[PDB]
């Protein structure tokens, strides 16, 4: 079962920092 | 000629329905009366304008609803009643819906066609 291989069917063939808050509120 | 002074019945003759005449003061009216004499007098007097540097709402109207093909800057005078968005409460709604004229005047050729028929059958 382990060596079942997903078929390679072809398609051819995010986080953010909180420093932005401190900056923006500062300005 | 066309500059000949006018009378209040003649004044009521030009403008359409639904407008009021205002005095704000009797005093500002006396300013308007001295204005003639002061068009000469106060133009010969101290005056000027200036601006200061300071940091800084903006209303405006095209003809929105869905589409409403565009209005030339002058044609507003005619089609102003269409600009206001007040809607859905008799004859006033027939004049209001009659702006299909605007669709005949300006717009795409299909709008002109379909509009033309729609106003024919009405």
């Amino acid at each position: 079962q382990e060596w079942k291989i997903p078929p390679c069917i072809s398609n051819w063939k995010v986080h953010i920092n909180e420093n932005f808050a401190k900056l923006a509120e500062a300005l | 000629e066309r500059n000949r002074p006018l009378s209040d019945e003649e004044l009521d003759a030009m403008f359409p329905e639904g407008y009021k005449v205002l005095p704000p003061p009797a005093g500002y009216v006396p300013i308007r009366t001295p204005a003639r004499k002061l068009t000469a007098t106060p133009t010969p007097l101290g005056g000027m304008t200036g601006f200061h540097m300071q940091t800084e709402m903006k209303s405006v109207n095209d003809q929105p609803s869905g589409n409403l093909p565009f209005l030339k800057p002058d044609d507003i005078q005619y089609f102003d009643k269409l600009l206001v968005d007040v809607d859905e409460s008799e004859e006033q709604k027939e004049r209001k819906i009659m702006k299909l004229l605007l669709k005949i005047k300006n717009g795409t050729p299909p709008m002109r066609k379909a509009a033309l028929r729609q106003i024919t059958d009405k």
């Binding site: 932005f20 923006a24 300005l27 | 940091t55 800084e56």
Partner: protein, 55 residues
Amino acid sequence: PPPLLVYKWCQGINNLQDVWETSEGECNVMLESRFEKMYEKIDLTLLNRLLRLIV
């Protein structure tokens, strides 16, 4: 035009006060450089507040 700028720049140098006098040990320095990455480092958030001061 740019070359005319070069001319304004040269005669601009030569018209400076006592520009070439080395008598007392005066020293002239020409410096040319670039800002390196300038476009790429502009910050949009800041640029907004900077434009709010203008328009």
